[PDB]
Nucleic acid binder design. Structure first.
Ligand SMILES: [Mg+2]
Ligand SMILES: [Mg+2]
Ligand SMILES: [Mg+2]
Ligand SMILES: [Mg+2]
Ligand SMILES: [Mg+2]
Ligand SMILES: [Mg+2]
Ligand SMILES: [Mg+2]
Ligand SMILES: [Mg+2]
Ligand SMILES: [Mg+2]
Ligand SMILES: [Mg+2]
Ligand SMILES: [Mg+2]
Ligand SMILES: [Mg+2]
Lengths: 226, 205, 156
RNA sequence: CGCGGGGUGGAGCAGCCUGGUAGCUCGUCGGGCUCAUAACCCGAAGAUCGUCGGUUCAAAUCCGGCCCCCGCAACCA
RNA sequence: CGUAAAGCGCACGCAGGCGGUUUGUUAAGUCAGAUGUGAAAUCCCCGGGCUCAACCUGGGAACUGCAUCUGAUACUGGCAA
């Protein structure tokens, strides 16, 4: 809903990477350097975060599908909880190159997963040999990790919320290709060029990602309540 | 200095009625209009860009019965004039005396109209004019001289003209056999299957 | 309503261990004759498959050109790799006096009057890219005035 | 039979002219939606373009045959 | 003009080319106007005469130049600080 400088500063949003890894494009949002580490200017974070929240709310009210993309070890479970609890979709394992631009092929895999999953419930993996009941079970496990968050999406989304613009550059680029706006939490070592709603701030602390996700999940929840 | 070969052959090569016959019958009843002439006629000619430009130019030349040297002079004159080069070129071709006498209807075809002009049956503004290419000016009066006012070919040609779209820019009377060229026709009044830009482009290569 | 045109088909080879693998490339341009034009380059083992891939690719990734009554706004220059391309607005009736690839792209984009001249390598792929880049880097009085904070009459 | 027109998911319609793309509306299945239905939303399924042929790298499109449909067509004591 | 042809082996330096900023002045370059001249024909525009056309012809435009006179002083040049 609403966040403030104290909450961001308690969760450690102002901390950035070390100076020798920064992006010169990220200079405007940089406050200073302390002990060879950049410090992110929260006076820029707060209005940008609130402005991104407003745009996300408007999309949610118009029944837009939101794809929560975050795949680092520090934000995988965080992004899964936020998207389940906001009734939207997510990716929290390795992003498949071409999820969006190659949606036709990726969709065939979605159909395969649904059929395999229903067969498991029915009991189909009993007539076949034990090996065929472990192979298919292993296939279902892999397909769940990869496309288990977008099996019900059914189409190209209307916005992406990428936790790490650095790590998830492929997803951002596919979004830019298709036409889908990106809301991205962007650290000091990252490139904000492909992002439409930049949100400067630390993207590696579990506390910070939980902060961003709770606020974003509440906004989408309230916008669908409408 | 005039094409004397078969007429429907040109219409088949262009794949379009060139009005080279009077119109007593249908061109599909007189020839195989859908098939190009010659041994390899049924084949579908895949035409290059230079080919389409050349075929367009040849279509216009064969409609009006104008050879290449004179036609090139027309383009030069049209390009020199002010306005639009393609529309000017069509205007000159329409101003030829053979075309005018055909359009008012003292001739089944443009070949028949041309023979009348040549054989001194036509008068513009009261004077016998023998020159086919003679450019008629606005407000001119074209008449059939008294000596030739008897010809059955003229009578039947007038009847056939009643069966075609009557040009809006000339004023004809079939009782006196005299027409008035009021104004120069526009691109709205001419058949839009012509593509003049191809001719302009062709002559600009 | 989209007019399409195949500019060039070209046979290439790969020279695999067994010998030469011949495949085909097709360059096509599509446009709505009213300011939108795109180009598509497709490869395949057969000519129909190649042109089909190119046409589909070209229907996507189209762009919008600010056309002035079937003519250009002002003289433009386009450059891609070794191909330079000069284009100039002309007066109604001139026609499209352009080169080989430029002819197809301009006709399909709706330019009816232009004076064009390619300087440099006349490779069709690079020529098409340069002419489309020139048509895209061309601005109209409305956007120029908006950029400069004036009215169109102020800019004339 | 004569002349003209027509045939595209179950239904109703574009696409044909300029040869490269099966679109629009309803309907069907499944889900959400609704306590449920309805309304709404999202998917999923559904045509080989009447058929037989030719044209041509390529045909719903261009050409012909057959099939049907429709209008007109001169004939009822 | 790195590798396709193409940076002298390197430097100093006369002639030459180019010249930070301010004021004043001059008016050379520059610009504006005016005048003289730039033969006629030819090219171009609007007309006219040969039945049309080629051709001939009336008027105009043009001849992008040069010279002189009168002005402007932004910039370049000169001179002065
Ligand atoms: Mg001769
Ligand atoms: Mg060269
Ligand atoms: Mg060498
Ligand atoms: Mg060398
Ligand atoms: Mg050296
Ligand atoms: Mg030196
Ligand atoms: Mg100086
Ligand atoms: Mg002076
Ligand atoms: Mg003279
Ligand atoms: Mg005269
Ligand atoms: Mg004269
Ligand atoms: Mg000075």
């Amino acid at each position: 809903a609403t966040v403030s400088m104290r909450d961001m500063l308690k969760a450690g949003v102002h901390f950035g990477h070390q100076t020798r890894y920064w992006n010169p494009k990220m200079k405007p949002f940089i406050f200073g350097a302390r002990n060879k580490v950049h410090i992110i200017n929260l006076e820029k974070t707060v209005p940008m975060f609130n402005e991104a929240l407003a745009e996300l709310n408007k999309i949610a009210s118009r029944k837009g599908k939101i794809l929560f993309v975050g795949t680092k070890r520090a934000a995988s479970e965080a992004v899964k909880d936020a998207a389940l609890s906001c009734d939207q979709f997510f990716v929290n394992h390795r992003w498949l190159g071409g999820m969006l631009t190659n949606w036709k092929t990726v969709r065939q895999s979605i159909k395969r997963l649904k059929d395999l999953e229903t067969q498991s419930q029915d009991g189909t993996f009993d007539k076949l040999t034990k090996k065929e009941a472990l192979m298919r079970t292993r296939e279902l496990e892999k397909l769940e990790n990869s496309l288990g968050g977008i099996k019900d999406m059914g189409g190209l989304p209307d916005a992406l919320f990428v936790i790490d613009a650095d790590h998830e550059h492929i997803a951002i680029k596919e979004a830019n290709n298709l036409g889908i706006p990106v809301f991205a939490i962007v650290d000091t070592n990252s490139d904000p060029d492909g992002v439409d709603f930049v949100i400067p701030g630390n993207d590696d602390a579990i506390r910070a990602v939980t902060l961003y996700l709770g606020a974003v999940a509440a906004t989408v929840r309230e916008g669908r309540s409408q | 200095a005039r094409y004397l070969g078969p007429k429907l052959k040109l219409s088949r090569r262009e794949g379009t009625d060139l009005f080279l016959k009077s119109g007593v019958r249908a061109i599909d009843t007189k020839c195989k209009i859908e098939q190009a002439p010659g041994q390899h006629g049924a084949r579908k000619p895949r035409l290059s860009d230079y080919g389409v430009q050349l075929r367009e130019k040849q279509k216009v030349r064969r409609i009006y019965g104008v050879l290449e040297r004179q036609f090139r002079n027309y383009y030069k004159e049209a390009a020199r004039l002010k306005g639009n080069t393609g529309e000017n070129l069509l205007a000159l071709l329409e101003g030829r005396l053979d075309n005018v006498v055909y359009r008012m209807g003292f001739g089944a075809t443009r070949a028949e109209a041309r023979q009348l002009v040549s054989h001194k049956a036509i008068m513009v503004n009261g004077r016998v004019v023998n020159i086919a290419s003679y450019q008629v000016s606005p407000n001119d009066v074209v008449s059939i001289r008294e000596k030739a006012k008897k010809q059955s070919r003229v009578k039947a040609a007038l009847e056939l003209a009643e069966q075609r779209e009557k040009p809006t820019w000339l004023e004809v009377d079939a009782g006196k056999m005299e027409g008035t060229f009021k104004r120069k026709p526009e691109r709205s009044d001419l058949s839009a299957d012509i593509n003049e830009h191809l001719i302009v482009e062709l002559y600009s290569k | 309503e989209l007019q399409e045109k195949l500019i060039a088909v070209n046979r290439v080879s790969k020279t695999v261990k067994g010998g030469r693998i011949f495949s085909f490339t097709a360059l096509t341009v599509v446009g709505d004759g009213n300011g939108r034009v795109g180009f598509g380059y497709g490869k395949a083992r057969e000519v129909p498959a190649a042109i089909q891939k190119a046409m589909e690719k070209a229907r996507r990734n189209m762009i919008n050109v600010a056309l002035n009554n079937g003519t250009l706004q002002h003289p433009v220059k386009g450059v891609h790799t070794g191909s330079r391309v000069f284009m100039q607005p002309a007066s109604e009736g001139t026609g499209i006096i352009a080169g080989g690839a430029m002819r197809a792209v301009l006709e399909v984009a709706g330019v009816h009057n232009v004076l064009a001249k390619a300087y440099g390598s006349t490779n069709p792929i690079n020529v098409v890219r340069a002419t489309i880049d020139g048509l895209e880097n061309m601005n109209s009085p409305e956007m120029v005035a908006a950029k400069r904070g004036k009215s169109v009459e102020e800019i004339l």
